[PDB]
Amino acid sequence: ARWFPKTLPCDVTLDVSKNHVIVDCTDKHLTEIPGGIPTNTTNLTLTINHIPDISPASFHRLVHLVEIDFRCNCVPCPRRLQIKPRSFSGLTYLKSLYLDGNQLLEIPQGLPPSLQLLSLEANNIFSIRKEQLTELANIEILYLGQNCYYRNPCYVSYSIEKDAFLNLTKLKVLSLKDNNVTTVPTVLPSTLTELYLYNNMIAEIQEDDFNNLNQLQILDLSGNCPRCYNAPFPCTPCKNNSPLQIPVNAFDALTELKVLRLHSNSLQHVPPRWFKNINNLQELDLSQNFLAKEIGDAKFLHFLPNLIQLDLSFNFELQVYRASMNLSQAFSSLKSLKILRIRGYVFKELKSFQLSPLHNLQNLEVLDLGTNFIKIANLSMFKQFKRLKVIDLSVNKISPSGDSCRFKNKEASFTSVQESCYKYGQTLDLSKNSIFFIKSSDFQHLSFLKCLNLSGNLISQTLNGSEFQPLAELRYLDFSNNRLDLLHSTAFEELRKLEVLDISSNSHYFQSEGITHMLNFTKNLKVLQKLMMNDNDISSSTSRTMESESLRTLEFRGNHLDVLWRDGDNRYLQLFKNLLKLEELDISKNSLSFLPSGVFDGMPPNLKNLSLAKNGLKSFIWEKLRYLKNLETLDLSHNQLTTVPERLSNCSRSLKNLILKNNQIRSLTKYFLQDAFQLRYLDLSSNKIQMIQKTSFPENVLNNLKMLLLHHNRFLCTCDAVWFVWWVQHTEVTIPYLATDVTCVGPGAHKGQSVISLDLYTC
Amino acid sequence: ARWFPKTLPCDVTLDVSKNHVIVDCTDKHLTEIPGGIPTNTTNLTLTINHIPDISPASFHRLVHLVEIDFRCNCVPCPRRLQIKPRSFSGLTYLKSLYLDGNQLLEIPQGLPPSLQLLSLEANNIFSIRKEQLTELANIEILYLGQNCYYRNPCYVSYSIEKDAFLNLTKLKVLSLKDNNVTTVPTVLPSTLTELYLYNNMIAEIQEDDFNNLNQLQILDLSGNCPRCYNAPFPCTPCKNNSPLQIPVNAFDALTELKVLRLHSNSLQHVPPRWFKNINNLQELDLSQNFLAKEIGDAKFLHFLPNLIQLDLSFNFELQVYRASMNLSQAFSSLKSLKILRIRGYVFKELKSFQLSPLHNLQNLEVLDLGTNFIKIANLSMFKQFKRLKVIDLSVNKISPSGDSCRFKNKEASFTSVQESCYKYGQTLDLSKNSIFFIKSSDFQHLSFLKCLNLSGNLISQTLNGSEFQPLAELRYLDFSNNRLDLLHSTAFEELRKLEVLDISSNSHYFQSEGITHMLNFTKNLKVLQKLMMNDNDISSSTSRTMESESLRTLEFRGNHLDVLWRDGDNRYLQLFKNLLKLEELDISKNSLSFLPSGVFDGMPPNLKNLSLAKNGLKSFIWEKLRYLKNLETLDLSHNQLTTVPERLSNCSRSLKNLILKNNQIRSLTKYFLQDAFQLRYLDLSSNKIQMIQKTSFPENVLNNLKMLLLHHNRFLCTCDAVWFVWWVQHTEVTIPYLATDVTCVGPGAHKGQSVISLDLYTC
Ligand SMILES: *[C@@H]1O[C@H](CO)[C@@H](O[C@@H]2O[C@H](CO)[C@@H](O[C@@H]3O[C@H](CO[C@H]4O[C@H](CO)[C@@H](O)[C@H](O)[C@@H]4O)[C@@H](O)[C@H](O)[C@@H]3O)[C@H](O)[C@H]2NC(C)=O)[C@H](O)[C@H]1NC(C)=O
Ligand SMILES: *[C@@H]1O[C@H](CO)[C@@H](O[C@@H]2O[C@H](CO)[C@@H](O[C@@H]3O[C@H](CO[C@H]4O[C@H](CO)[C@@H](O)[C@H](O)[C@@H]4O)[C@@H](O)[C@H](O)[C@@H]3O)[C@H](O)[C@H]2NC(C)=O)[C@H](O)[C@H]1NC(C)=O
Ligand SMILES: *[C@@H]1O[C@H](CO)[C@@H](O[C@@H]2O[C@H](CO)[C@@H](O[C@@H]3O[C@H](CO)[C@@H](O)[C@H](O)[C@@H]3O)[C@H](O)[C@H]2NC(C)=O)[C@H](O)[C@H]1NC(C)=O
Ligand SMILES: *[C@@H]1O[C@H](CO)[C@@H](O[C@@H]2O[C@H](CO)[C@@H](O[C@@H]3O[C@H](CO)[C@@H](O)[C@H](O)[C@@H]3O)[C@H](O)[C@H]2NC(C)=O)[C@H](O)[C@H]1NC(C)=O
Ligand SMILES: *[C@@H]1O[C@H](CO)[C@@H](O[C@@H]2O[C@H](CO)[C@@H](O[C@@H]3O[C@H](CO)[C@@H](O)[C@H](O)[C@@H]3O)[C@H](O)[C@H]2NC(C)=O)[C@H](O)[C@H]1NC(C)=O
Ligand SMILES: *[C@@H]1O[C@H](CO)[C@@H](O[C@@H]2O[C@H](CO)[C@@H](O[C@@H]3O[C@H](CO)[C@@H](O)[C@H](O)[C@@H]3O)[C@H](O)[C@H]2NC(C)=O)[C@H](O)[C@H]1NC(C)=O
Ligand SMILES: *[C@@H]1O[C@H](CO)[C@@H](O[C@@H]2O[C@H](CO)[C@@H](O)[C@H](O)[C@H]2NC(C)=O)[C@H](O)[C@H]1NC(C)=O
Ligand SMILES: *[C@@H]1O[C@H](CO)[C@@H](O[C@@H]2O[C@H](CO)[C@@H](O)[C@H](O)[C@H]2NC(C)=O)[C@H](O)[C@H]1NC(C)=O
Ligand SMILES: *[C@@H]1O[C@H](CO)[C@@H](O[C@@H]2O[C@H](CO)[C@@H](O)[C@H](O)[C@H]2NC(C)=O)[C@H](O)[C@H]1NC(C)=O
Ligand SMILES: *[C@@H]1O[C@H](CO)[C@@H](O[C@@H]2O[C@H](CO)[C@@H](O)[C@H](O)[C@H]2NC(C)=O)[C@H](O)[C@H]1NC(C)=O
Ligand SMILES: *[C@@H]1O[C@H](CO)[C@@H](O[C@@H]2O[C@H](CO)[C@@H](O)[C@H](O)[C@H]2NC(C)=O)[C@H](O)[C@H]1NC(C)=O
Ligand SMILES: *[C@@H]1O[C@H](CO)[C@@H](O[C@@H]2O[C@H](CO)[C@@H](O)[C@H](O)[C@H]2NC(C)=O)[C@H](O)[C@H]1NC(C)=O
Ligand SMILES: *[C@@H]1O[C@H](CO)[C@@H](O[C@@H]2O[C@H](CO)[C@@H](O)[C@H](O)[C@H]2NC(C)=O)[C@H](O)[C@H]1NC(C)=O
Ligand SMILES: *[C@@H]1O[C@H](CO)[C@@H](O[C@@H]2O[C@H](CO)[C@@H](O)[C@H](O)[C@H]2NC(C)=O)[C@H](O)[C@H]1NC(C)=O
Ligand SMILES: *[C@@H]1O[C@H](CO)[C@@H](O)[C@H](O)[C@H]1NC(C)=O
Ligand SMILES: *[C@@H]1O[C@H](CO)[C@@H](O)[C@H](O)[C@H]1NC(C)=O
Ligand SMILES: *[C@@H]1O[C@H](CO)[C@@H](O)[C@H](O)[C@H]1NC(C)=O
Known about the structure:
The structure holds 2 chains of a larger assembly.
Chain A: E1 11-15, E2 20-24, E3 43-45, E4 53-54, E5 67-69, E6 82-83, E7 96-98, E8 117-119, E9 127-128, H1 130-133, E10 141-143, E11 159-160, E12 173-175, E13 194-196, E14 218-220, E15 259-261, E16 283-285, H2 292-297, E17 309-311, E18 322-324, E19 339-341, E20 347-350, E21 366-368, E22 376-377, E23 390-392, E24 427-429, E25 451-453, E26 460-461, E27 476-478, E28 483-484, E29 500-502, H3 507-511, E30 530-532, E31 553-555, H4 561-564, E32 584-586, E33 609-610, H5 648-651, E34 657-659, E35 681-683, H6 699-703, E36 707-709, H7 722-728
Parallel strand pairs in A: 2-3, 3-5, 4-6, 5-7, 7-8, 8-10, 9-11, 10-12, 12-13, 13-14, 14-15, 15-16, 16-17, 17-19, 18-20, 19-21, 20-22, 21-23, 23-24, 24-25, 25-27, 26-28, 27-29, 29-30, 30-31, 31-32, 32-33, 34-35, 35-36
Antiparallel strand pairs in A: 1-2
Bound molecules: a molecule of 4 linked components (NAG-NAG-BMA-MAN) (2 copies), a molecule of 3 linked components (NAG-NAG-BMA) (4 copies), a molecule of 2 linked components (NAG-NAG) (8 copies) and 2-acetamido-2-deoxy-beta-D-glucopyranose (3 copies).
């Protein structure tokens, strides 16, 4: 509630339905908590700052607070944060509290009984006692990880007294990652659901370690006795490279377990007895181990019928280069398997019969096989994997056939990189491979491919319309980081159903001058929608115009359009005129010092998104914008403009997203925003503007403005801008960083003063 | 003769034995020829400048000139250079003349009969007539190339009248490269020795084309009907991709021919009848052709018993990936073959039996096989090639086994890149290959290897002293652009005879902090002499000191020595102290803002070459140089020093090569060079110095100075430096760019004035 604040430098978000008020003071360099904080707020953000300590009077009048965040307030900085006694007892409605990165020595006392979450990561608490945990009898989620490890050493092994967590009957999630823990803290409460003991120094597991945990769902034991070969981070292998000793009858009481992580445990064998009782396991991680021989046997896979995810990445043997992948026949028992990763299983040749166990997996979607240094791989063997969604053929050497400060979620699963080409259907990610030329015979029996990534292959070829013949249903093609010779206009002609084409980073042949550059090759593409050819350094073009009846988006950044539009050369003025359906243009970083007269007349009639960022436009004309009757998102950021148009209404009748970020403008015209009621977005940040007059900023136009930025510039706070001073502190226009970034240059003592906090009584 | 010049801005070189005087005015921006040119000069250099034309009075008093160079005086610039009539008749002793890059339309007339060389490259002369060549009856070398091609088009085919060169009885070398020539200009004089007709549009060769040439030694026919696939430069294939039609009885009259170039001719067959008469052929070029099938036959090789060089690079077929290299059995007839290049013959697997024809070549030294995309290659097959000097295993994908403005020489042969490792003996250049780990078994039967290049392989391995076991006699090892984990001090221990080690560009594992970095691994290397570990970004080291009893040179540039020598951290102060025999150090680009006191005491006793370039030394102490009793070549270029030492004699008693290039020094001490008789080299260029006093620059010290630089700085030419003005124009000290780079800041009209050309009579 309370809607209107007075001088708070933190953003306020109101949710009437949720009855939640959010205050975000992230990255504000506040030495002390600012005054005037509303009593109706629910979430308080007090992240990285210069707060010396915490006082009971800080939250004296705040009784509705339900979330306090104090993450990374002192990253190892002055002395450690000190908390006065009874500093949290007054928050009866408190439910969540974060104290990560505060260099605390012991667990704070006096916490309210209503607390449900407590985070104490990146601290110096290496001792756990029941006396300090007595007050936390109603806690549900506990985060005590990253207290003693290589980044934040403490030189003392973690000590937990007997039955420390036993009386925490409400505990559900416990994390002890990177805490130098040697022994699992028995006895954990029976209500635990997620346990995170990974990246510790645990060497053995007892048979009664998880005897009472029946509701556990997620168990993590990574980093115990890890595989330290070629590790880019400090680690200590266990002795004799011994594996993490886990008894056969260890996961017996676990019946609701769903996620089990054993990554980087130096395991050599996986007994089937482990998975005898856990019949509902969904995700299993076994990466960074020594299970190369176990993959050939994989006898334990017969006890996982409901498995969804299986990770076996980077299990290669030392000084061993396998001739082929030895997949066990027990892989056919993974009926519900969806994602499979066999990376780091480096081998020479991949054959069709080696993937036979995966032929009957109906629910399999993703097959990851990248980073395996595969030399010989017949692509026609994938004709049986039509139901697969993503097939990974990454940096391995396949060649053509011959003749705590952020992330409040804390413990979260690894989110897979959702590439832009996955949404189009079947994907064959052949990026960074050893393919140096394209044959139509190689891609035979692959008409089902809706996607094909070939970035980084460094292919030097002159396509004439026959290489991608079998790819009849291809919709997305990636050809970045290659050497494409556009000597013919018939390239990609046989890709009838292609929609998006990426030929970026092909600067090699485009840099050479005097050779033909057929830029009209998009005419044959009937259903092409997006074309990305940026960072190509295109300086000449044999074709006068580019023709396309369906292209809508075109990226032409990082090229040389100045030479194409050189003074006295009108050949390429109407280069984009024939693109009738084009709606977005991205001609940026083209070293365009100036725009010759006539280019705007040659722009497509349906242009709607024009960008000229980072170009260096010394003088950009504005009366020529009348030609563009559909322009809405003109962008001139990071340019060297110096003059605003006399009347924006006379320039464009539809511009609504004008941007002039990081420009050099010292003053605005007296009628800059006169009768411009169609404008919605305006940006003038990072400029050299001095003052704004009333006649240039009418309130009628400013009322409908969604967002306006005037931060990080050189406004002068003198008596000549009383109207501006009154308006900035009495309007509802959303101006970000109003009290943090925009300051006053002068005069004299007014250096660094906040405009919204200015009250010139003498004026 | 004449020894002493007056105001010439060109360097003068005297050779009394050769009676030659050389004047070099290269890159001087001279609008007109300066006055005071000696009459005794022999060679005149008048390269790229702003000379408008040539007048007869330019060489009026010069009668001893024997060489005039006028190369690239106007690169397509004002209008073309105009030569007045009878502008060269007065040079009776002229023998050589260069007029390249002058946009001349016709051959200049009135040349003296004593001329022997004439260069007219990069001009607009596309017509040749006997009338203009009548005056050149005594010429020997003619250069008329690059007159009409893609860089300098003329849109007209070259026209040569019948028997134009017939009467040039003294002609020996003729060049017509890039001249758009269609037909060979019959009839060439019988005294021709070198013919250069390459990069032309010749489509056919007549049987009488070379009927009279019996003394010809070098013949070039490259670029005629060229192979235009993947060409980074403009080219036009002949029609029907026809080959250059050469009759069988074409090289019949040629008996002294030694070099024949047929590179890029689209040849398909090489008849043996071509080489029937040329029994003394030494170098043969057949690259960029379609002789992939001909290599399997190679029937013509039986007629080349005296061949020395054979080039067959880049003859791969389009859309064809050969399974293996098909070398003909006729290769055994090349008894005298020394260098063989089979690059661009892309094939999958290389086997031992495929190199059988080369097993009996006693004189074979270099075997080039790079850029072939070889996948499988057993390195043990090279045990039979012990006599070979260089074996090329370049960017192909071999993996570990599984289970006119310059170049006055004009027409010169392609100089092979002499890598630094070739001088050590047998070389196995395995750079940029697909090797990702090292096994001792792979390098078996290779104990004869004196060199091994492994740069760019990106190998991630933790060597412990057993990988390079069979390489007992290895002396040079290159490991640049890799990922070396120095977790053990026993690395390279088994390389007993190693002398030079290069572990540069291994920044990956060295950038990580907290992992061990055993920098004392050089102790085991008993005979190590040079160690290059630059650009490694080394910021921490587990070993306190580096020990080596034989290391003499150490490159440690592009690292982080500031963190190692951080204030309050004296652990790594004596890092290089134990290097007893070290004589050269290259610690540069280390971001060293300042040198903490004590590092000089920890320097090796025998240090002689110290470099601190591009470091950013805000304040470098000088009294600590007394510790270094053997310093001679101290370098502080591209630094931010501001104060010179009070007395250089008191600082170092052996410094003789002090360098302060690109520094920021405004003034020198009044006793900077007092009693410093041991100094030989001094550099103060690109500084902010204002004036020099007499008491700081005694003549006794300056007499023995070999070289001194005071160019490109901010000297002020007022009346306060009369002594300096007198001394700079009356001393014999070699001061480069004395009248071209060093100018006067002021005062007033004295901007840009030459100090050596200053005469202040009013002072
Ligand atoms: C202001 O502070 C409030 C608390 O003081 C915040 O309310 C919290 O909001 C989160 C959601 O953002 C709730 O989390 C719930 O989690 C359960 C369990 O889901 C678990 O599993 C999923 C994966 O399937 C995982 O993503 C979750 O993180 C959990 O691990 C869900 O079923 C719920 O729908 C909900 O997501 C908290 O319970 C809730 N706390 C309280 C006390 O209600 C509020 O978000 C804060 N607002 C801002 C703007 O920061
Ligand atoms: C000043 O001008 C003088 C002429 O006006 C220059 O004298 C010339 O010097 C060059 C050497 O630099 C002489 O070239 C001769 O070439 C023959 C034939 O060798 C040929 O083959 C070799 C490869 O085996 C090749 O490298 C050569 O370039 C030749 O193509 C050699 O046998 C000789 O030893 C010598 O190298 C000229 O003959 C000579 N000209 C005259 C008229 O004597 C002088 O070099 C100029 N000085 C400077 C500093 O520029
Ligand atoms: C995780 O806990 C283990 C518990 O052992 C820590 O190992 C201990 O580390 C300290 C500090 O390096 C060792 O103290 C050392 O003692 C030697 C004398 O033996 C002394 O010369 C050193 O200066 C240092 O004080 C201690 O011995 C060692 N414990 C054992 C059993 O070896 C480990 O450091 C902890 N990890 C982190 C990141 O804090
Ligand atoms: C085809 O495959 C290539 C390589 O696998 C993909 O390129 C990679 O795309 C990812 C995601 O866009 C890039 O990651 C990003 O890197 C930047 C730094 O450049 C970082 O700031 C981002 O946060 C993100 O991590 C990755 O760099 C890029 N790799 C290269 C070599 O460009 C490409 O996206 C694939 N194409 C399709 C259509 O899936
Ligand atoms: C090397 O010599 C050949 C000799 O044929 C040159 O080819 C000629 O090039 C000119 C200029 O492009 C052509 O003139 C053209 O004529 C057409 C009408 O046919 C006109 O529309 C053009 O505007 C141009 O004026 C000429 O036809 C052509 N000769 C032949 C037989 O095709 C070639 O250009 C020369 N190469 C260089 C680098 O100068
Ligand atoms: C081992 O093989 C590698 C690659 O074949 C060699 O590196 C290459 O060395 C040459 C000659 O030093 C470099 O050429 C130079 O390039 C610079 C530009 O960086 C240019 O300014 C010079 O004029 C010269 O052309 C080449 O760049 C370099 N390549 C790489 C990737 O570094 C290496 O020298 C070999 N090692 C031994 C001991 O022979
Ligand atoms: C694939 O892996 C399986 C299981 O490790 C291998 O089968 C074993 O092979 C060894 C060596 O011959 C025998 O001693 C075992 O008795 C075999 N066990 C079983 C259950 O068959 C198999 O040889 C591997 N195949 C390949 C090609 O490496
Ligand atoms: C990859 O596999 C496919 C199919 O298994 C092979 O296609 C065969 O090609 C030959 C010659 O073109 C035909 O005679 C066969 O009938 C094809 N097989 C089928 C099932 O139709 C292809 O040759 C394989 N690739 C390589 C390099 O061997
Ligand atoms: C596209 O390029 C391919 C590759 O060169 C052409 O295929 C060749 O065509 C020529 C002329 O008909 C034949 O002599 C070759 O035998 C063909 N090679 C192969 C491997 O088939 C193809 O004709 C070109 N297409 C167009 C329209 O230019
Ligand atoms: C793209 O433009 C080029 C010209 O820049 C077109 O090439 C011309 O094609 C016609 C028709 O065959 C020929 O008569 C001309 O001689 C060609 N000119 C050149 C310079 O090659 C090409 O056809 C265009 N492609 C498309 C698909 O429109
Ligand atoms: C290596 O090259 C030789 C010469 O081109 C090949 O020998 C020819 O092979 C063809 C095809 O079988 C025959 O028609 C010719 O009669 C052969 N000529 C001779 C002189 O033998 C040979 O087959 C090639 N070998 C490989 C493995 O490609
Ligand atoms: C590369 O060639 C060498 C020699 O030709 C092979 O060395 C053989 O290795 C086997 C098993 O180690 C021995 O039984 C043979 O006696 C060796 N040959 C000789 C001549 O001694 C080596 O195996 C080859 N590499 C590969 C990958 O096959
Ligand atoms: C250097 O590293 C190699 C590779 O690990 C070591 O060779 C292994 O040594 C262990 C211990 O003796 C054996 O169990 C393995 O069988 C060996 N592997 C191979 C491929 O031989 C070697 O011992 C190490 N040497 C030193 C001095 O540490
Ligand atoms: C290089 O220096 C490291 C120390 O930085 C040496 O490692 C020590 O070796 C001794 C002898 O075995 C051990 O007692 C120490 O515990 C080791 N210290 C560490 C930190 O590992 C290493 O031996 C040195 N190598 C050489 C060749 O001198
Ligand atoms: C124009 O581009 C911006 C870029 O963020 C986008 O937000 C906007 O929706 C685009 N406008 C149209 C009409 O597509
Ligand atoms: C500017 O706008 C006014 C008012 O609509 C109009 O009268 C005038 O013609 C316009 N001028 C230009 C150059 O568009
Ligand atoms: C020191 O290095 C320079 C670098 O050019 C070299 O010329 C000089 O000979 C070296 N001095 C000694 C004594 O090796």
